[PDB]
Amino acid sequence: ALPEKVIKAYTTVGSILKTWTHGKLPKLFKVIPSLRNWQDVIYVTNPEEWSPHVVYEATKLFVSNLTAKESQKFINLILLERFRDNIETSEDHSLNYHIYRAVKKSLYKPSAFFKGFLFPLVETGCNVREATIAGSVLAKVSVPALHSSAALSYLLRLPFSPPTTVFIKILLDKKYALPYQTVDDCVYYFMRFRILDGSNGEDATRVLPVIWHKAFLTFAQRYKNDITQDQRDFLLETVRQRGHKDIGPEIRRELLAGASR
Amino acid sequence: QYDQIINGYENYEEELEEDEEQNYQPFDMSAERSDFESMLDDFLDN
């Protein structure tokens, strides 16, 4: 257990943080990232009762002063939870703009964001509104092609869900250069929703949302020249079996306009 | 490059496990910055 001087001091800073909106953060709060056991002390400040102002400033403070591994824990244990809590309990299921900007700031350490925020989110019942808000952050902030690609590969290997597909589409829309292994993962992903006349899983017949088709189309526009002829044929077949009324022809068109790598 | 980083992503949960297994320390006041208690004091005196 903690020294009672610690508990007493950081219980009070905790109360200050409930209503803090401007000025300098309490000095004792600003030394927390300089502490080895910052996790033990931070909890005493009662993070879930911090003002949204403090969430923002704390995110700046902690993400830029902790190591990536440590940042990742902050992002996950505090930022992510606040993001979800606030969206679920608000009357219009919107995110307070301070928290919103906190999530943008956390993308400055893209690896701590993907491991601390995004992957836990899509793997723990992310809903469509959560993916739409977090997705808009991901769309607006530049991320290194390398980390972007690696996150795309990770999401493509996950089981299907519409919110995951939202993020997949966002990362495709970045239209960054992709390592050929991520291109391959994209092909394998869209492929796996086709019907193989023997063994099929749910993906072959499940209903596909419009967002899956826009993702397919996006991948087709940007990356038509980076796939093999074999891969082009699997995707053209995917569009034949699973294509969409309006988007399907566009996808086919883009796929046929591509030259093999 | 990509080789390095994709493996860190695929096993991110395992790496968190291993990092905690290695670097966890219980709270110790004498293991933190030596002005700590002094700062705690100036504060509890407003």
Author numbering:
A (entry chain A): 205 to 401, 403 to 466
B (entry chain C): 360 to 405
Sentences from the study reporting this entry:
The 5' region of pre-rRNA that consists of the 5' external transcribed spacer (5' ETS), 18S rRNA and the internal transcribed spacer 1 (ITS1) is co-transcriptionally packed into a terminal ball of ~40 nm in size. These particles represent the earliest assembly intermediates of 40S and are known as the 90S pre-ribosome or the SSU processome. Within 90S, the pre-rRNA is cleaved at sites A0 and A1 in the 5' ETS and site A2 in the ITS1, yielding a 20S pre-rRNA intermediate. The fully assembled 90S contains an unprocessed pre-18S rRNA, U3 snoRNA, approximately 51 assembly factors and 18 r-proteins with a molecular mass of 5.0 megadaltons.
